[PDB]
Ligand binder design. Sequence first.
Ligand SMILES: [Mg+2]
Ligand SMILES: [Mg+2]
Ligand SMILES: [Mg+2]
Ligand SMILES: [Zn+2]
Lengths: 141, 349, 38
Amino acid sequence: AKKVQAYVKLQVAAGMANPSPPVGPALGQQGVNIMEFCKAFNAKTDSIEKGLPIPVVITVYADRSFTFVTKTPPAAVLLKKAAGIKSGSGKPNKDKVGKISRAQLQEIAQTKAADMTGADIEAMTRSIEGTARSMGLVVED
Amino acid sequence: KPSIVAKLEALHERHEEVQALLGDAQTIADQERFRALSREYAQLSDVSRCFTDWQQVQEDIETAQMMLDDPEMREMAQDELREAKEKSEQLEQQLQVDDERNAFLEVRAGTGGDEAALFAGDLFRMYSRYAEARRWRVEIMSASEGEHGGYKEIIAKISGDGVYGRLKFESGGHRVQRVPATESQGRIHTSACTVAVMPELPDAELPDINPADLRIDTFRSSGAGGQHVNTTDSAIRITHLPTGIVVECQDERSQHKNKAKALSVLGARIHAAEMAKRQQAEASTRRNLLGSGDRSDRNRTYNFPQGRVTDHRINLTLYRLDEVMEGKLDMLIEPIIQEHQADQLAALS
Amino acid sequence: MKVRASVKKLCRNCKIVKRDGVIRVICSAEPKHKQRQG
RNA sequence: AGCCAGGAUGUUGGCUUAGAAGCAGCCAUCAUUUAAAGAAAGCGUAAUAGCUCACUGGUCGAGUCGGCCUGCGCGGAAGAU
Ligand SMILES: [Mg+2]
Ligand SMILES: [Mg+2]
Ligand SMILES: [Mg+2]
Ligand SMILES: [Zn+2]
């Protein structure tokens, strides 16, 4: 398999093409076009939602023709509308940012269970909650 | 929106040209232009989302127009009123996106004589009332009274928040036309007063006697000393390298005493050379802020027979002189800032 | 070369070698780290 | 100590700021697969990348690794017939 050549997964939520610095100079230094994301990239964005932060591979050659494959949204932004919290920690021990029920996370883990490694589905719960503890998210018993 | 609408409309395309210059790879070898674009990403993505909200409101306005046969006036009336309200809210919130310290307010009499002193007293009372209805403190630093009524020259120090941000537009000359109190007949007279507003600054005086930048010479002295004076280095000379100030001392027979007092004189006469510079700088600034009160150079006119106050910088007239003279001059200073700030965002080229 | 009365190791590549009765430091990565005692 | 091999997984993290992604500075420092692997000790980007280390497997194969107390030496150490 061809390893990383000219693509790094970094861009704003998939909702629209949004020709902004996060997308323009994300490819402007590598080529292709900024406006193309409204047709090919946004073909599947009508399926999911408007405003899902997902990282997409931006493989670009010297031919200025690029192919893109996305993935699940990262767990940090994944449990935001599912947790109701728009902010994040940075002082998650002096205070806390909110509350979260324990049962609210595993039912979304199967979305990320395909691209995450682990013995089974329940193992993914521990990885998220340990990360979730860094955001000050208090588990609801 | 007199021209800020036009300013944005001309600049609204620049909000897309910044994006165009983002993805050209010709401005990425350097850094300055890309830094400018990144700082000026289209109306600052927070306010950009605010503009998306305003455009949603405008699109809601755009609909529900192409149908007739209904007494529908009230709903789009309130809709366009809400659109204007949110438009002005957008104006203020994107205009909000320094010098907010205490101030020295100086006002003195111009043309007129005693009547100028009376008007200076009235004007200072107006400013004092405006300050007291703001939770600001006013203290009379100095006073020179005007024989009959108010002051030949009153200078006061105002302490509070954002004082200079609001009072810095009061400099210049103010003209008053009215029937004076020191007049036997009923003749109307025109007089002027002169107002200056200043900030406050730290006034550190560092004694740069740091010997790392001094050149010191010891040598023989001249005069009547017999055999001792010839074979001794009892004269001192110190030069301060950064400023080029040179001082020498040979008055006493001891090198230590000469060095000590010469160094003291160097310190005193290097401090004076900075105090004089600061004094002339502040004097010059006061001079070009003040003007020369002669009823021809002025910023606002108070006509008492007509009860009118007019401002010549923005060409705005009002018929609320009595409310102004009782300390409600806020309505005068709000529009000026509205113009002034409208030029700060334009001067980015 | 920096000549000083206290030669010490500054990175992980620095080495202590005594040549001709003189203690000195040399490292293969940073040429600014070579020094001798004097 | 050498010599081969590995040296992994969601932080494009909120927390600051235009951009900060282990390695600029504010918090925390969990979990998974595993023989190992740090949510980063170092070099390196405007921002990514890229480059080492720990640690873990195979050959080699006999010793090896740092403090404490003490004797004698080394550098630090330049003046005028
Ligand atoms: Mg004598
Ligand atoms: Mg030699
Ligand atoms: Mg010795
Ligand atoms: Zn070194």
